């Protein structure tokens, strides 16, 4: 139940003569590849992004993908002619494809297609198929695409064999990055009156943040969303509703793998907060 490899594709279709396609690739929450519409070739975002594949093996994949990109555009533009509502530009196709890696040899692959921000089609087994809920008109396009056996055969090989094989390469190649421990640093601040505990710079994500009065955990601690930093570390804030006079005696406590059993305990004062 560990690392997930994601290839994220964003295709926009404005006119019947304007479109672009950009891609990002993630291994867990670290970006490994970039492929903007401008660039003829895929970019490495990490020194180890080529995985265990030889230059020639990598060339074979890049080429495989370059054919795919041009082909994808034209297929979609033609298939729009038989969509509903009739030629409904603009059109936003999103693809999410990769494989989730597990301990041992186990992995499960996926290819999900979203149309106008809604999940509509996946590749399942040997063919494309519309998911329950997906609009009626997609039936013909999927039937048409499923006639292209070459594509089916390729996609099968990619999902079943290529993905897991490549990603093992990455997980081994970028082991010292993926397993890095980055220490969180905390600070305090202030239509509900509250105190905010800022916790930034930690890696990986699993973190424990709680407002406390001594031994007692304050159950009113609201955990925020996890926000990314520019340097592949995490930012998170826990808030606590407090009225004037309830601040004294409170502290923010942070448990994180990188701290080695030594939690950050941050006490409040007159902006002069302390450890």
């Amino acid at each position: 139940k560990n690392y997930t490899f994601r290839c994220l594709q964003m295709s926009s279709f404005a006119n019947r003569s304007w479109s672009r396609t950009d891609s990002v690739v993630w291994l867990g929450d670290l970006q490994t590849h970039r492929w903007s519409n401008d660039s003829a070739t895929i970019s490495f975002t990490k020194p180890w992004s080529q995985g265990k594949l030889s230059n020639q093996q990598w060339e074979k994949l890049q080429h495989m993908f370059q054919v795919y990109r041009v082909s994808f555009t034209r297929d979609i533009q033609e298939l729009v002619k038989m969509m509903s509502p009739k030629e409904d530009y603009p059109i936003e196709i999103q693809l999410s494809a990769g494989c989730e890696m597990y301990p041992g040899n186990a992995s499960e692959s996926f290819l999900h297609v979203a149309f106008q921000g809604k999940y509509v089609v996946r590749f399942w087994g040997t063919s494309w198929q519309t998911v329950p809920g997906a609009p009626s008109w997609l039936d013909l396009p999927i039937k048409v695409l499923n006639a292209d056996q070459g594509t089916s055969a390729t996609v099968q090989m990619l999902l079943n064999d290529t993905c897991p094989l490549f990603v093992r390469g990455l997980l081994e190649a970028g082991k010292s990055d993926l397993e890095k421990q980055e220490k969180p640093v905390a600070w305090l601040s202030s239509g509900h009156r509250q105190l905010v505990c800022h916790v930034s710079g930690f890696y990986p994500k699993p973190v424990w943040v709680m407002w406390m009065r001594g031994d007692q955990e304050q159950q009113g601690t609201h955990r925020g969303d996890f926000l990314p930093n520019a340097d592949e570390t995490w930012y998170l804030q826990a808030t606590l509703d407090v009225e004037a006079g309830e601040e004294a005696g409170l502290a923010c406590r942070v448990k994180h793998s990188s701290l080695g059993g030594q939690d950050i305990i941050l006490y409040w004062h007159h902006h002069h907060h302390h450890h």
Partner: antibody
Amino acid sequence: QIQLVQSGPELKKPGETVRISCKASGYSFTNYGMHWVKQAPGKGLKWVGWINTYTGEPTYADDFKGRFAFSLETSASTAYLEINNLKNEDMATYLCASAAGIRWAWFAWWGQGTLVTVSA
Amino acid sequence: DIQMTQSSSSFSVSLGDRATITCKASEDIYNRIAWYQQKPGNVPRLLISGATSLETGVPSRFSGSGSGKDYTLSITSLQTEDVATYYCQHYWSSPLTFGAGTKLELKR
């Protein structure tokens, strides 16, 4: 059982019109569009164009614009090719073939063909 | 218009030999190529589409290959059953164009 049956051989004089038919069976007529291919005596295949069996919108290869017209009757799963003002250069066998659009236009199914002979 | 020019209009092969027919497109057609077999008196028969994918009817001695502009149809060992004309065809964009055909004949 996907099958295409065309009209019989036609013998026509220069200037006359011909109307070839092509009945499809074994698949939903509206699914695949209908393509037309010309083959003059020992000359190899030329794409005439195709017609969308759902919309009725035809597309003609440049060399066939004017004088060549695709029509169809969805009612009876039949496609038609009409050639007006027949010329000697038209004397050929015309084959209908069903395929999805143009970007999936590989022709797995062919009509038996209709030979049009042009002579005065 | 994309041109599809087949190297040879015809050549002779010794029965049993490996045959290779090359089809060259005037611009990159990214694998959207179909091969057809036609014998006098018959309709074209589709052999391979998508550069490499054989139709379920077709014997495995037939083989499709290539990329970009250059594509090849290959027969590992020609049988009498295989003397026919072979057409390549692209379906990358309109208009669809066929090659001129390569007629396979027997050496003697």
